[PDB]
């Protein structure tokens, strides 16, 4: 429920810890004409699946700086050997060294790379921004535009989907098969309902808006009903609804 990426309906929480997925939670079932078949997640005979930890998905600063120096030396060599032949660097030779340098190479190809060059003292401004905005900035030290993206979560989320058994198992935990949707490809979510979005501003009271803010929570609980509303997780007497 927690470590499912938000597109698949989960919360998409990043885990800097050690959370084991019980093996009994990696099994799903599918009904074909011959009958109902059951599948497990992995042929591997190991311990219960561990969700990938964010620890291994951040490159250390020492490696970051060594890689940045090597990439910038390579880029300087390429630029100096391309000035002579008079060709602009056209994103083709700068593909292996894409997200390596600390002033990420993506900043060289950024759309507003000309107007950013006149933005000076941006680190100090970012640090001092805490005295103007009411919200503390976790990235008070770097600027995405100027410095680029210094972390990639593509591999982490890839391995988190892989560890959970994939979309098939994750949706087995959900009501997806209860919607009778033929496939998971051509589908999309809607963050707010028509009345929910139209009610974001209609001159409501504190109680009314406070109650209205919980609708996405209701949708989230409904999406995860076959898993949250289970006997094992909530031990005790079960009550059936009236109808």
């Amino acid at each position: 429920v927690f470590y499912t990426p938000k597109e698949l309906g989960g919360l998409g929480m990043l885990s800097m810890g050690h959370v084991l997925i019980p093996q009994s939670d990696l099994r799903w079932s599918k009904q074909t004409d011959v009958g109902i078949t059951h599948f497990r997640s992995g042929m591997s005979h190991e311990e219960d699946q561990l969700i990938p930890n964010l620890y291994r998905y951040i490159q250390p600063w020492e490696s970051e700086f060594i890689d940045s120096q090597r990439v910038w030396a390579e880029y300087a060599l390429k630029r100096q050997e391309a000035i002579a032949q008079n060709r602009r660097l056209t994103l083709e030779d700068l593909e292996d060294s894409w997200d390596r340098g600390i002033p990420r190479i993506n900043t060289l190809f950024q759309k507003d790379r000309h107007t950013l060059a006149y933005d000076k003292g941006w680190r100090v401004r970012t640090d001092f921004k805490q005295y103007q905005v009411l919200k503390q900035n976790p990235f008070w030290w770097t600027h995405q535009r100027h410095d680029g993206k210094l972390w990639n979560l593509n591999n982490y989320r890839t391995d988190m989907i892989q560890a959970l058994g994939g979309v098939e198992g994750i949706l087995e935990h959900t009501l997806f098969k209860g919607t009778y949707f033929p496939t998971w490809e051509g589908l999309f979510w809607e963050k707010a309902s028509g009345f929910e979005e139209s009610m974001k501003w209609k001159k409501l009271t504190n109680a009314q808006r406070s109650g209205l803010n919980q609708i996405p929570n209701r949708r989230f609980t409904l999406w995860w009903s076959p898993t949250i509303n289970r006997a094992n997780v909530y031990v005790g007497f079960q009550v059936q609804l009236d109808l």
């Binding site: 810890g17 084991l20 019980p22 990938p52 930890n53 620890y55 291994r56 951040i58 490159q59 591999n155």
Partner: peptide, 22 residues
Amino acid sequence: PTGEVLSLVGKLEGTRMGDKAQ
């Protein structure tokens, strides 16, 4: 299988930080 998050102190020291990333 408890569902609680375990502290990885004294754990997974056989792995670096630059692994599992291209």
